[PDB]
Symmetry: C3
């Protein structure tokens, strides 16, 4: 079976993380999203895997990925136009994290066309599956204002080469787009499209807080207590902690699991790591530094007198002493974030900041809830960051 | 003996604490001021205790007090004279001011056995601020001089009386009052002309809770004198405890916490890791004190949380307060002189070289807030991240 | 042999440290610079030592120094030539610049046995900033070129001379006038034409204390080379000590403190709980370092206190300083280039990528103060709570 990972979006909704990396390389603990997808495909015996990517990202993917074909897109309909297969293929959206491979292993043994459905609490935001009374696909309704069902399109398809025929027929939509689901809808009129319901953990990494979501799940479900580092005396560890090689934890550090401490990290003295602290790799967490429910990416340093809660901090970031993130509004309502120029609810009462790569903060910087700081920004000592900060912006 | 507690003042001097509670319910360790008063009255065998309160506070007192009569000051005159106008007794009663904390009950037990009228006197260092007792040469009361500019004596009116129903006769003589005030002491002065008013001098600890810093005063004394080392909580390893520490039930103290007594840790509190509790830290109940948080000589009331990277010194923080990370209180002027506080619109000295802030109930501070010495923050205020609070903040004010 | 220490400069380049002390009394660990110089002279058998000082500093020197002659630079002419005009000797004398720290005494012990005039040369990496020695082909002194734009050599004038009374004759021949002062080296240049001036090259550690960062330089060297692990204080349990730590008498170190040597903890200091002392922390005497306070590569002078929630890196803090809670020093520029400092009104490079602040005596910072890299704060300054100190602050200035 050939497999195609569709990873050709701009990743705009995931800014500022995607200022410096494609969505497919967002870390989940110590490894990129796309390595999970590949690994799970391979458990099903699939060997021939291709990723479809944008022109601008091709080189990044080639650097990172060894024995995987990388093809540039020449929407999801547009992406599969660059998929070269004769009979049938497995197609997965590249923004998905999924815990289970067996549904995929099943669907690649079917002769018929098939898709995966999953139940979500917000079907409004997705393609909703309407089933006929043999429980095969009737149609996919993109983002219905009144959703007839909880069952959505999971973004996992086993499609026959007949899909190209249906792709050629499509013009549409009212939202000014081609799609992939439009072609499936035409296919379902003439063919029986099976729907396999998916019961495991499923998340699309659409918005920056979803990085926290999947990292928490991974930490809860995919790893187990380990210590390959050096823990000094007077370190207190409760619950599940993963300590990778070369990580150093100094006296007075206090850890309430679950916590992930990546390779080469340097912690303490007198640090406090709270549940769902994910330190991806080579992180510096220093004295009187407290971290909670945050993803802190490769090489980033929080050396002195700082609190990082409910945040995503990208790679190579440095926080001057006394940089603080606010994670709660005064009125305790859900924290709003600007995502592609729309102000939307994160769904979280507690939410900190999203900080791009190579950011530097001066000493005594104050960051407000839900704020995005673009890659390469500088925040000047003492500043109150009360809005989004642009790529490379020097905030004074 | 009937007893009356006079608790019908506005409590304005005690703002912002009294924005959300009557003075009688100011905590002293884990219990309100009035419960001490009631408990000490009961040690003398008194059972019939009434509290006289304002109309607006009646419901609050009823909620809080079980087997105590609550009577409203049947308006509409202010002062202690007006308050005892609602006290219903036939012959004699024990009367105490509801702003007082007193360590000793035995002077009270004595005075309720006397047939004569009697009052308690106590020696203070600042008699200028009080009613001074002038004694005749049989050491009975001559007169009470309210706030004399040149005080003839250290002996003041302690606000504890055993008075006969004749006081009502003298109260009726006293001229009300464009200002709508009636002072009980004016009636006692008329009574002392015609009767022998005995004066029992009180040698124990006595304090009135007049200004917000007096909340620290009495809490300190209580911690020093009324409670003893106890641990009903859960103390992790690598907790360092020196001197006297009271840990109530369900309190959790995490590793790295360092405690220099005397310290009171109220029920359900959550401390540490890596907290520092200095002498005269009083955590009333269900308090959160987190990592890199230091507290010294402060009263932190019910449910209040100081979760990260903060220093709280010489302060009173009321109920349900939340300090954003990095909120700091200044407690010392650069010139090291006494810290001044605005009390009923007058700028006065606290009498303290070290004094922090007084924070009302339900306040929220943003991250990185800076609060200056002697500042009052009204209940329900919100302080915006990074603000420098260099003046008093109003009730419900959003300070930016 | 008579010896003269020339300590009569204004010390302006070392402001703000020299706002309250002469350069001679800058501490190196627990003792002033000049006590090292005296001690090393005495290892050579020298007993008759005189210090030449300014009129304004005479009394300070007399208070501090016991059995040492103190002479004021009479002449109101500035420079080293002017200074030795007040040196009274008949035949020969050892002359040392009072800004020098030197590890070795044996070069001095040799040079005082020579009949000829002699000077000490040392190799430095920045000869541009000093008098460069040009040697003749017998390796004697040809001439000293003050601050040559193109330096012909690494060998500079170390500021250590054994000169004969003939130097006064050459001093009388030389100009002034008065930018533009009387330089001792100009007289040595005339002397070298008529006499053989020997040059002994110095291979040990040599530093002049010219700019405020040099206080860090020499303290680091002293800590690395002159002292060894010791504990005369009281260390509580759960203190972690790595590498070399000197703890002087009466110092107290509280639980949770973490120390990465080398570190000097001076007498009577009070550390912790939960403090972090990083390499090259020098706490000269009676210092307070409190909870959640981190120090690295800094010299903190007598009686100075950093009690809460502060980071002090790559800094010099003078005597009797108090940092309000949450005072932070920045020690790195965003562009990672060398930190610049204003020194006598010229903006120059410190030569350091990491450099914090230089803080004068008796400074007080309010809570939550932010100090930028390379900033100087004059003695007696006050910094208002929440201020961002982004320029130099004057002597006694109230920065708001």
């Amino acid at each position: 079976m050939k497999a195609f990972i569709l990873a050709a979006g701009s990743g705009e909704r995931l800014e500022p993380i995607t200022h410096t990396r494609p969505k497919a390389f967002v870390p989940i603990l110590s490894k990129p999203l796309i390595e999970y997808q590949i690994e799970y495909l391979r458990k099903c015996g699939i060997r021939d895997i291709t990723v479809i990517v944008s022109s601008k990202n091709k080189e990044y993917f080639e650097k990172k990925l060894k024995e995987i074909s990388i093809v540039t897109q020449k929407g999801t309909g547009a992406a599969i136009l660059s998929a070269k297969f004769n009979d049938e293929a497995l197609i997965i959206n590249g923004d998905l994290f999924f815990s289970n491979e067996k549904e995929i292993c099943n669907i690649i043994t079917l002769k018929e066309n098939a898709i995966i459905g999953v139940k979500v609490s917000n079907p409004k935001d997705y393609g909703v599956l309407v089933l006929d009374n043999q429980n095969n696909l009737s149609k996919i309704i993109e983002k219905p204002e009144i959703p007839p069902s909880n069952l959505i399109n999971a973004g996992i398809y086993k499609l026959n080469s007949d899909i190209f025929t249906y792709l050629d027929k499509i013009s549409i939509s009212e939202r000014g787009e081609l799609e992939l689901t439009d072609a499936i809808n035409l296919m379902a009129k003439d063919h029986r499209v099976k729907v396999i319901e998916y019961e495991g953990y499923w998340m699309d990494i659409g918005k920056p807080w979803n990085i926290i979501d999947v990292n928490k799940w991974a930490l809860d479900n995919l790893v187990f207590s380990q210590n390959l580092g050096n823990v000094e005396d007077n370190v207190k560890i409760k619950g599940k902690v993963i300590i990778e090689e070369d990580a150093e934890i100094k006296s007075g550090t206090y850890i309430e699991g679950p916590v992930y401490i990546g390779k080469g990290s340097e912690i303490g003295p007198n640090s406090y790591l709270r549940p769902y602290t994910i330190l991806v790799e080579k992180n510096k967490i220093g004295a009187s530094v407290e971290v909670k429910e945050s993803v802190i990416m490769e090489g980033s340093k929080i050396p002195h007198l700082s609190y990082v809660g409910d945040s995503v901090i990208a790679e190579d970031v440095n926080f001057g002493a006394g940089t603080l993130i606010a994670n709660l509004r005064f009125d305790e309502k859900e924290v709003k974030v600007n995502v592609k120029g729309k102000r939307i609810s994160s769904g979280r009462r507690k939410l900190g900041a999203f900080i791009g790569g190579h950011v530097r903060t001066g000493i005594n910087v104050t960051i407000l809830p839900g704020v995005k700081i673009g890659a390469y920004a500088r925040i000047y000592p003492g500043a109150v960051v009360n809005r989004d900060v642009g790529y490379g912006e020097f905030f004074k």
